Amino acid sequence: MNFGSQTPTIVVLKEGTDASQGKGQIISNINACVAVQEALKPTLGPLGSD
């Protein structure tokens, strides 16, 4: 009845598509913005650096 020896299961998303649940991703997104924020932290002020 079957076409061959075995039949591997289908991944729902495409192979290599990154996905994650829970509170870890939104913390990573916030930490990503804070990482960009730290570059512009000492630039603020009339006594900042280029």
Binding site: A39, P42, T43, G48, S49, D50
Partner: protein, 59 residues
């Protein structure tokens, strides 16, 4: 010497003459040329000092 006397045309004699007074040595420079040495230097170094983050993308 320059603190004592007010005459301000005495400098470094490089050719080895016996007198350092430049009235006799025939040397003259422009004011716009000597001014730009200080202006372009002091205005650049403000930019050099402000740099904090230095990112260099390797070719």
């Amino acid at each position: 010497k320059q603190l004592k006397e007010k005459i301000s045309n005495i400098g470094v004699d490089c050719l080895g003459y016996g007198s350092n007074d430049m009235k006799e040595l025939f040397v003259v420079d422009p004011f716009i040329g000597k001014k730009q040495q200080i202006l372009l230097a002091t205005q650049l170094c403000r930019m050099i000092l402000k740099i904090d983050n230095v990112i260099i993308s390797g070719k």
